[PDB]
Structure formats: structure tokens, C-alpha cells
Amino acid sequence: GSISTAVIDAINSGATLKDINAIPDDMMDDIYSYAYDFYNKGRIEEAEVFFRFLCIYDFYNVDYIMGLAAIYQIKEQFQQAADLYAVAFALGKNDYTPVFHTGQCQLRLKAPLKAKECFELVIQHSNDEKLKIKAQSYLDAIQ
Amino acid sequence: GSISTAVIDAINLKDINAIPDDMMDDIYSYAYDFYNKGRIEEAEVFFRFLCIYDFYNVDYIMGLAAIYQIKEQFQQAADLYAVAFALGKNDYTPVFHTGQCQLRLKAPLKAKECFELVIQHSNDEKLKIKAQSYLDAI
Ligand SMILES: NC1=NCc2ccccc21
Ligand SMILES: NC1=NCc2ccccc21
Ligand SMILES: [Cl-]
Ligand SMILES: [Cl-]
């Protein structure tokens, strides 16, 4: 999957497509715009193909990763989604939505202590009061 | 033999339990021995092998990222530290080392983001002291 493909790329350490500037920036921006248009039209499969393409070319891109993670969560590939949300967080995503959505994923993965850690982190650090209410709703049901 | 012939049929590695747990532990220990002896190229072979066998093992991945960092392959190290962070979810040591990498890449705003993530979320006091020292210098 996405994570294993990234690890194998990193192991092999070769010269990469982006290292070659294989695709210009304004074309990558365009492909991202198309990926999101598929996504907004419900064309989850076209969106996934485009986001997977983007993440092969530039995996360490917050916006690409967040888009693919959302599609994995929709497709109930909850572990891949959780992992990619955490990648986005390490890369600098500047809010707690990756953590909130990872909590949802961990619940579906029957990992309630991980989920609790995610929602508590939202409540303790987010400045989105509505997101914190949603996080508390989830915490209240983990018993 | 029977075991290899079955593993290869299925392949076409860890899901199959191809290598016993205690032998994997031994290889990890030997990799760390090479590393501690300064034999970085030997350590790198062993950590690459470990990571191919179990690409979701945070400590195996951290070992390879440390070698990329030692070898001044700073972007490759930073990239792998992000995966390492993601697999363990709540250990900010890879993020700390990513901050070091970003400084060497002359990306101080990225470094500051890394060290701030450590300060705000880690419960590792010794790590946070190091992170704050860097923050004091940037
Ligand atoms: N449990 C988690 N701590 C930090 C984080 C970031 C993204 C997803 C999960 C977590
Ligand atoms: N697939 C995986 N994502 C996170 C993780 C940790 C340990 C083993 C497997 C996984
Ligand atoms: Cl937030
Ligand atoms: Cl075993």
C-alpha cells in the first residue's frame, strides 16, 4: 500500500522522478485540482487514482497525503488512512483534523486507547471549538 | 526446501513468518553492533534488509533513517523519519531528528516546526530539553 511503497522507495534510495523535476509544478498543481474535482463529484475511484499518482511523485506533500488519507478512510482502509494522517501531521499540517480523523479510524480498527489519545489531543490542543465538541462526543462513548 | 518453496509460492515475507522472531532480533542486534562500531555501510545493509522484511517496524525504519542522517542524506532521512513518526503515532523522536535534518538543509522554519511539535506534544523531558535548546538558537 501507500506506506510500504514509500518505505521501499526510501530503502532503494535511487534518483527519483521529482529529483529529476520530471513534471513541472504548474502541471502537478493542475493534476491536484483535477483530483479534488473528482473527489467533490463523488468519483472516489478517479480521485484515488489521481491522488495515488500524486503521492508516488511527491509523497512528502501534506495536501496530497491528506487527500489520499480521506479516500482511504471513505473506503474503510482505516489503517492506511490513520498512517497517512500521521504522516501529514509530521510534515506540518497546521491543524488537528488529521488527529481527529485518525481517532475515528482507530475506533473502527478496535484500537480504543489510540482513539482516546487522538480525541484527547484534539480537546487539549485544537482551537476549533466545534471540532472539540465532536471529539468529546466520541470520548464520551469509549467505555 | 518445503519452507522456502512455500514462502516463494505465496510471495508470487513477514506475513508468511519466513524468518523466526529470534533470528530477526539477532539481525537487529547485529545491525546496531555494526553501527556502534562505526561500520556504517555494513549497518546500512542490515537495516535495509530489516526494513524490507518488515516495512512497518518503527525501530527498523529509525535505524535506516539514522544512517541516512549520518551519511548527510538529509532529505532522505527526513522523509523516512516522517514515516517512522506515522507508524508509531506518539513518539516524537523522529520529529526531533527531522528538525536536525532541516537545519542542515538550511530550512530553519521547517526545523522550528519540528522542534515545536516536540515541545508541545512529547512527554520525553530529555528530548524536549534538546528541542528547546535548538529553538533558543533559531
Ligand atoms: N495519536 C497521535 N498522536 C499524534 C498524532 C497525529 C496524527 C494521528 C495520530 C496521532
Ligand atoms: N500497517 C501498520 N501501520 C502502523 C503499524 C505498526 C506496526 C505494524 C503494522 C503497522
Ligand atoms: Cl484544529
Ligand atoms: Cl518465531
Ligand SMILES: [Cl-]
Ligand atoms: Cl562499513
Ligand SMILES: [Cl-]
Ligand atoms: Cl538526501
Ligand SMILES: [Cl-]
Ligand atoms: Cl497505529
Ligand SMILES: [Mg+2]
Ligand atoms: Mg515480538
